[PDB]
């Protein structure tokens, strides 16, 4: 019995997708509802839109864009070409917005149901779809990300803590460089790190939720996972005690590093995936490592939250679409009998109303 | 013009 | 660090 459940959802090559177009610059997955792939067929560029609820009937349309990202919840697509941004509602067959930036947008993504984040060489912007809203500058980029490949951008629930991540080669390894920005303080901090997420967590005894920042890093000395409260606690709350724990890489994976993180607020667990397809599960409250294993031969290059199970969904270089979530009937007995940690098993059983700690 | 060619 | 002490 394992504490997690692995599932294959689709094989993209079986829907006529060219394997050469299955990668980070051409395939986007902004949520679990859609996958978008840019393909060139003859002289004509096209977008293929896969509805994950009806995947055998994809729409293919002509485009002239360098990047396409679908809204997390609706058939509303954003397209760009250099500095030119355009937004379309597909069901309404209409152009809803257009904007031309001063600088080329090098990376973008949806950070909520109605807001797109834009990254240029110099700065980060947020653009709301409400009313006649225009892009608003959030902060200037820090010099420590200069020349990095930008791989991610994330925020907390309230959009008060913002996090930009890039990577590059230094001393024959992949080094991550993050910029954490506080909107209320108007201050940045540079941090060495590879993958991260924010989460809301209500501690025993507190009236208000804590906002936590979790990040994983493979540094010059080994892997580490940090879980730390950002800002001063909501009035009347105890502060969350910070945790720092090891992240294991085997001796034969000397070049591997963290590429993705998703946190389940249903189970209060952190899912970590590495470039070469290793999956780790940690407890959010303590940082205790619950499980690790290799689950993809091919590299995983994009992930999202998997709504139905509160797990993680992703796509590998072969075009396998896969998910991992907590196995609710097994996790508590596993922790008790295989990890031999009755304290953690009892805590998780009562905290998240899971069955299995009636006999320890 | 448009970055997407809409069907109709 | 300004924002966080790691």
Author numbering:
A (entry chain A): 4 to 363
B (entry chain C): 2 to 9
C (entry chain D): 2 to 7
Recite the paper's sentences.
We have solved high‐resolution structures of NTD bound to peptide motifs from the cellular clathrin adaptors β2 adaptin and amphiphysin plus a putative viral clathrin adaptor, hepatitis D virus large antigen (HDAg‐L). Surprisingly, with each peptide we observe simultaneous peptide binding at multiple sites on NTD and viral peptides binding to the same sites as cellular peptides.
For the cellular peptides (AP2CBMpep, AmphCBMpep and Amph4T1pep) the binding is similar to that previously described, with the 3 leucine side chains of the CBM LΦxΦ[DE] consensus sequence occupying the hydrophobic pocket formed at the groove between the 2 blades. In addition to binding at the clathrin box, we observed significant binding of the cellular peptides (AP2CBMpep, AmphCBMpep and Amph4T1pep) at the “arrestin box”, which lies between blades 4 and 5 of the NTD β‐propeller fold (“arrestin box”). While all 3 CBM peptides bind in the same general orientation at the arrestin box, the molecular details of these interactions differ from the interaction seen between NTD and the extended surface loop of the arrestin 2 long isoform (arrestin2L). The first 2 leucine residues of each CBM (LΦxΦ[DE]) bind in a hydrophobic cavity lined by the side chains of NTD residues W164, L183, S185, R188, V190, I194, F216, I231 and V233 plus the peptide backbones of Y184 and S191. Similarly, His‐NTD‐NEMO mutated at the arrestin box (Q192Y) was captured less efficiently by GST‐AP2CBM but the capture of this mutant by GST‐AmphCBM or GST‐Amph4T1 was not significantly changed. While His‐NTD‐NEMO mutated at either the clathrin box (Q89A + F91K) or arrestin box (Q192Y) can still be captured by GST‐AP2CBM, combining the mutations (Q89A + F91K + Q192Y) reduces the binding to the level of the GST control. We observe that combining mutations at the arrestin and clathrin boxes completely abolishes the ability of the AP2CBM to capture NTD in GST pull‐down assays, confirming that CBM peptides bind promiscuously to both sites.
